């Protein structure tokens, strides 16, 4: 029925997901559909992330890669935002307002050849990883529980997702309330505590201006919204 | 130890609350406290609400009551924002940057004599209502389950709270993760669904500009942040 990150989402799947109320279905059959998917938008694909940069100097908006290609953000911090962009679904171009998978983005010149390989791994936190035994699609979380990636790197991707609608379901392709995420084994309370009560390890992202470390949630709120796009933008200088 | 809405909050109470990790406690004996309460701020008192107004005309920021006293917001919508303010803990003065209980606000001239009685009831969704038989402090939720208030009015206050840190615990005086709120009988999934999938019913609040109905979450994102205060402000005109 509705459009998810990659795959379409069934109306049943969302009601089971604790997203839509049993009544709103009896209202779709004998009702609209462009408004329902408009009321439950943040779950289908998610809310805005740090789409681009906006430097006070020229008053222009820029993608993340373009700004590092011209010296306004060191290659280092560029990777983080472009990873958190991948881990939520799509790479973004504020100028044109495009949202696209790593492969498309690379064709369109929105991301470097040097970054492409890493941005192709952080996107598996969207479409799923693979189980060494069984070859079955498992969650980023289940991938941390089987030791296929560092808890610092994995944790950094989970907060990018939680700060833009909730943790994603690999199989169903959409955002999920924290409780359902717990029921389906894709997150837990031990992890919520690490974000609510951050430490010096969980300071994954770096703020260019104030030059300090913080969480996606924290950095994201340091951003300004755009009117014709809505995409949150990180203000910079020089 | 930490400061809550009204009452102080024990370090045990927060760990039980699924808020602080068991390690951060043993790390309170070993070097801070002004930073811990700075990492878990949104729960202690909460995030910003719609504190005031900002009219494009004069470029000034105003409290909600002052704007209706000069004609820039009809008495009707004034009540909504001043109720949602009460139901989150404190009434707000963007100009001076004060946060205060209804009683103090009324002395200070931030709210009218006509509104005082209603703003004194919506604050019970903060400090608790009273159970007829046994006269014990019950949750706003429990007050809805015993028919002491309309589900439309009660629902409108729960979304004001959820959009600013989470539902509040009357007894403990702080915000709570949705799952704990469920465990303690202060919310449920049947209610999350009404917010995630909102209707013409759960549209409680009115936007003066676009002139339409929406949820606190939606209206709040239509707001701009302030630099010296951080309080979200609702932009208007005339």
From Swiss-Prot, chains A, B:
Residues 34-236 are annotated as: 4.5 X 38 AA tandem repeats (Domain B). It is found in: Cell junction, Desmosome; Cell membrane; Cytoplasm. The modification Phosphoserine is found at residues 1, 17. Expressed in oral mucosa (at protein level). Expressed in arrector pili muscle (at protein level). Expressed in the heart in the heart (at protein level). Plectin repeats lie at residues 1-25, 41-78, 79-116, 117-154, 155-192, 196-230. Homodimer. Interacts with COL17A1 (via cytoplasmic region). Interacts with DSC2. Interacts with PKP2. Interacts with PKP1. Interacts weakly with TMEM65. It is linked to Keratoderma, palmoplantar, striate 2: A dermatological disorder characterized by thickening of the skin on the palms (linear pattern) and the soles (island-like pattern) and flexor aspect of the fingers. Abnormalities of the nails, the teeth and the hair are rarely present. Cardiomyopathy, dilated, with woolly hair and keratoderma: An autosomal recessive cardiocutaneous syndrome characterized by a generalized striate keratoderma particularly affecting the palmoplantar epidermis, woolly hair, and dilated left ventricular cardiomyopathy. Belongs to the plakin or cytolinker family. Major high molecular weight protein of desmosomes. Regulates profibrotic gene expression in cardiomyocytes via activation of the MAPK14/p38 MAPK signaling cascade and increase in TGFB1 protein abundance. The N-terminal region is required for localization to the desmosomal plaque and interacts with the N-terminal region of PKP1. This is Desmoplakin. The chain holds residues 2209 to 2448 of 2871 of the full protein.
């Amino acid at each position: 029925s509705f459009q998810g990150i990659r795959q379409p989402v069934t109306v049943t799947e969302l009601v089971d997901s604790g997203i839509l109320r049993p009544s709103t279905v009896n209202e779709l059959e004998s009702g609209s559909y462009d408004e329902v998917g408009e009321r439950i938008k943040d779950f289908l694909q998610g809310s805005s992330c740090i789409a681009g940069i906006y430097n006070e100097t020229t008053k222009q908006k820029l993608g993340i890669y373009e700004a590092m290609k011209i010296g306004l953000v060191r290659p280092g911090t560029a990777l983080e935002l472009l990873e958190a962009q991948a881990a939520t679904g799509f790479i973004v171009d504020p100028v044109s307002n495009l949202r696209l998978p790593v492969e498309e983005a690379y064709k369109r010149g929105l991301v470097g050849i040097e970054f492409k390989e890493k941005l192709l791994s952080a996107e598996r936190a969207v479409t799923g990883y693979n189980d060494p035994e069984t070859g079955n699609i498992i969650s980023l979380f289940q991938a941390m529980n089987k030791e296929l990636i560092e808890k610092g790197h994995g944790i950094r991707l989970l907060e990018a997702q939680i700060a833009t609608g909730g943790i994603i379901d690999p199989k169903e392709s959409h955002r999920l309330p924290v409780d359902i995420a717990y029921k389906r084994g894709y997150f837990n309370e031990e992890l919520s505590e690490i974000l609510s009560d951050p430490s010096d390890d969980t300071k994954g992202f770096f703020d260019p201006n104030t030059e300090e470390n913080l969480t996606y949630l924290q950095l994201k709120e340091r951003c300004i919204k755009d009117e014709e796009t809505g995409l949150c933008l990180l203000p910079l200088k020089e």
